[PDB]
């Protein structure tokens, strides 16, 4: 039973960014990559996505010599001013949860506010990540952030985050 991992860990990213999916390397032979069900021409344990296009969005799976395939990993490509990024959208109670109010082309974001279910959780003048050290079921809900890029105010698309047991 293998498992795909992302680096950076963000499943949600901007059009043009880069991400690398890694097939749980442990225990050499070959690595099969499935993008949207189709077999990709990649054979390494690490599939490199560069200059991400919307097309790159979708389900990804890897297969080693362990018969069974890996659990699906969904990647989504956006193109907005701010994008709320999460270390994971389904967290297990007890583990950390990381949220990042990511700005277009890495441009500066000021007056960053993170909201949960409509409520403003934290404010930061300089952009800053929000980190939930010990995830609680209470921490579930729909999050989003707002900030200022190029002196203008922008809001990010909401993201559902669920913390199970």
């Amino acid at each position: 039973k293998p498992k795909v991992s992302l680096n950076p860990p963000w499943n949600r990213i901007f059009k043009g960014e880069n991400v690398t999916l890694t097939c749980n390397g442990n225990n050499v032979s070959s690595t099969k990559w499935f993008h949207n069900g189709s077999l990709s021409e990649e054979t390494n344990s690490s599939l490199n996505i560069v200059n991400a296009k919307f097309e790159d969005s979708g389900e990804y799976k890897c297969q080693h010599q362990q018969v069974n395939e890996s659990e699906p990993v969904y990647l989504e490509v956006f193109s907005d001013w701010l994008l709320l990024q999460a270390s994971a959208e389904v967290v297990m109670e007890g583990q950390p949860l990381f949220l990042r109010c990511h700005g277009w082309r890495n441009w500066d974001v000021y007056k960053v506010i993170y909201y949960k279910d409509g409520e403003a959780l934290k404010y930061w003048y300089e952009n800053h990540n929000i980190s939930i050290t010990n995830a609680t079921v209470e921490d579930s809900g729909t999050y989003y952030c707002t900030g200022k890029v190029w002196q203008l105010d922008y809001e990010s698309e909401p993201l559902n985050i669920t913390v199970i047991k």
Partner: peptide, 21 residues
Amino acid sequence: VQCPHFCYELDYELCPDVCYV
């Protein structure tokens, strides 16, 4: 969605899609 001038002034479009069309 309001975008800065440069998104339209410049040659190449540097801003998110939400700014165009």
